[PDB]
């Protein structure tokens, strides 16, 4: 394996804005929006991010 190119760094681009529903989508009551198994829409946007 002469090619030894490894990965060095990672970028986490979390473009989602909590509490903002884009016009593209219409949700329903069972829209569980878990991300990373953690759904604090209760806690407010800053704790969520």
């Amino acid at each position: 394996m002469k090619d030894r190119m490894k990965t060095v760094s990672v970028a986490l681009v979390l473009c989602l804005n909590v509490g903002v529903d884009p016009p593209d989508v219409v949700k329903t009551t069972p829209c569980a929006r878990l991300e990373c198994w953690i759904d604090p829409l209760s806690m407010g946007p800053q704790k969520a991010l």
Binding site: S42, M43, G44
Partner: protein, 88 residues
């Protein structure tokens, strides 16, 4: 702490009171009512989470389900002497 209290919200019983979250049909009556001349509604269950109201003080809006299925809503809060209110 002052920068987390504004973010405070509805709280789940699992993280503050597992015992109450597991509470089920007791021998107790519904707190706000007792009529010796009529049947007594027994506490059937309580809601999984409470709602925190925002002001200078933060009461908590409790829901409670009785044996008949009726729901009763209360404001839980500290820093108070309610005995005067009972007399009034």
């Amino acid at each position: 702490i002052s920068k987390q209290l504004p973010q405070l919200t509805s709280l789940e019983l699992q993280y503050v009171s597992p015992k109450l979250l597991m509470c089920r049909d007791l021998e107790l009556a519904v707190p706000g009512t007792y009529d010796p001349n009529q049947p007594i509604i027994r506490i059937q269950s309580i809601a999984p989470s409470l709602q925190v109201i925002t002001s200078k003080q933060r009461p908590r809006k409790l829901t409670l389900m009785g044996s008949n299925g009726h729901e009763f809503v209360f404001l839980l809060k500290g820093h108070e002497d309610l005995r005067q209110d009972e007399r009034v």
